[PDB]
Amino acid sequence: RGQVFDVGPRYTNLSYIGEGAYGMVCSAYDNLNKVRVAIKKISPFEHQTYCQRTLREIKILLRFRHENIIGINDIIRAPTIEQMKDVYIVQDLMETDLYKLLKTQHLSNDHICYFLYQILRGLKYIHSANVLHRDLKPSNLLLNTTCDLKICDFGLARVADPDHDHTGFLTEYVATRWYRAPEIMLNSKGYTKSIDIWSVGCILAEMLSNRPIFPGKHYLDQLNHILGILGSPSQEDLNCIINLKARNYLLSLPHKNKVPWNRLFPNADSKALDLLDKMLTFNPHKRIEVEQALAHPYLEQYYDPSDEPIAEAPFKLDDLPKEKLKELIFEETARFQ
Ligand SMILES: CC(=O)c1ccc(N2CCN(C(=O)CN3CC[C@@H](C(=O)Nc4ccc(O)c(Cl)c4)C3)CC2)cc1
């Protein structure tokens, strides 16, 4: 679109797909490996934050190999650090994403069940590598005509760090508001695996009704949408809240009873709602883990631990200047030259 998309000599015949904060994505013909691929142009080097998100996307996707996780097939950039101003990331081309599908189609239970299984199968692999995605939502679940589902966008991913998850009440957060677990607003930095399970619970709810379950209009409104459905937290859950300010705030609220899942989703499968309840558990310590979710009765037709692979070894940037991050991005993309 009169921007500049220099991907030769391997890729030709471009067509605009979309754009966002990250940059722009087109489809293109891989003249060396038969078919059309997706190529995204990233221009991150003027700011540390954009460099961090780019290095995470690249380092992680290059180390992962899983059917339900988008791969990186190739990376195009200049031959020297001085001339490198953009980076083009080549990935398998997908037809749509769950966000776009839910705007035009109501899904049958058997589609919801199969898509949920794939999300959880990919998430099992991510979590087995000690990685957190931290921004799961419908637009980050890519889909094709044969209903294959691939998780994308690891720009906000982190290595899990439960010992350093604690933070103060109403601490700012970057990931997508509607998919934030309640603890993000109360006492958590989103450094435990439970953060992702909550987001998957939101996605399941959204597949059941074609509407976001907790559409907060702003930061604090997100927690009151969550409490408006889950109802007031139990005494046990309040005494696990850590922060004086978070405890005081929850104790100051009028009592609110839980809205039954069968009243929000009167046409849903009862086993889907039992699993939804366990993913949307207020206390992250009581929230179901990915392996338990895969073993839940709702997914019994697909559950097969021998066909739900894990990573061969776990993964083991904050305040690193943009210049150092550019050098690391250069080194990480060297294998494709
Ligand atoms: C603000 C700013 O300058 C900025 C700069 C960088 C930045 N990063 C975010 C994380 N990165 C990504 O590339 C994430 N991508 C972007 C697009 C999405 C994706 O994978 N789509 C996709 C893939 C295959 C397909 O077949 C199809 Cl149809 C679509 C996730 C790195 C860059 C964020 C922000």
CATH of 94-320, one of 1.20.140.70, 1.10.3720.10, 1.10.510.10, 1.10.150.300: 1.10.510.10
User: Which ligand 1 atom sits nearest the alpha carbon of residue 154?
Assistant: 10
Any residues with CB less than 8 A from the CB of 209 and at least 6 apart, and which?
A: 264, 265
DSSP for 150-199, written as a single string: EE---TT-EE--GGG-B--TT----S-GGG--THHHHTB-S-STHHHHHH
Any residues with CB less than 8 A from the CB of 260 and at least 6 apart, and which?
A: none
The C-alpha angle with vertex 81 and arms to 76 and 84, in degrees rounded to 5, equals: 45
DSSP for 50-65, written as a single string: HHHHHHHHHHHHHH--
The one catalytic residue in 30, 97, 135, 153 is 135
Instruction: Tell me the C-alpha distance between 191 and 159, whole Å.
Output: 8
- Where in the chain are the domains? 1-93+321-337, 94-320
Ligand 1 within 6 A of 17 CB? Answer: yes
Resolution number, Å = 1.6
Instruction: Tell me the C-alpha distance between 17 and 23, whole Å.
Output: 12
**Residue nearest ligand 1's atom 30 by CA:** 153
Distance from Cα 40 to the centre of ligand 1, integer Å: 7
Question: Does 6 participate in catalysis according to the annotation?
Answer: no
Q: Which helix (H) or strand (E) holds 24?
A: strand 23-30
Range 1-93+321-337 has CATH code 3.30.200.20: yes
Ligand 1 within 6 A of 233 CB? Answer: no
Known binder of ligand: residue 24? yes
User: Which ligand 1 atom sits nearest the alpha carbon of residue 21?
Assistant: 1
130: Cα within 13 Å, side-chain hemisphere: 9
Structure tokens at 258: 């839980």
User: Which ligand 1 atom sits nearest the alpha carbon of residue 96?
Assistant: 28
What does the H/E/C string look like for 82-141? CCCCCEEEEEECCCEEHHHHHHHCCCCHHHHHHHHHHHHHHHHHHHHCCEECCCCCHHHE
* Distance in angstroms between the alpha carbons of the first and the last residue of the chain: 27
Which of 6, 9, 5 minimizes the C-alpha distance to 31?
9
* CB contact at 8 A, 329 and 78: no
User: Could you tell me which residues are beta bridge partners of residue 320?
Assistant: none
Any residues with CB less than 8 A from the CB of 269 and at least 6 apart, and which?
A: 109, 113, 298
Ligand 1 within 6 A of 22 CB? Answer: yes
Structure tokens at 248: 């005081």
Elucidation method: X-ray
Q: What letter would DSSP give residue 244?
A: H
Ligand 1 within 6 A of 155 CB? Answer: yes
Distance from Cα 246 to the centre of ligand 1, integer Å: 34
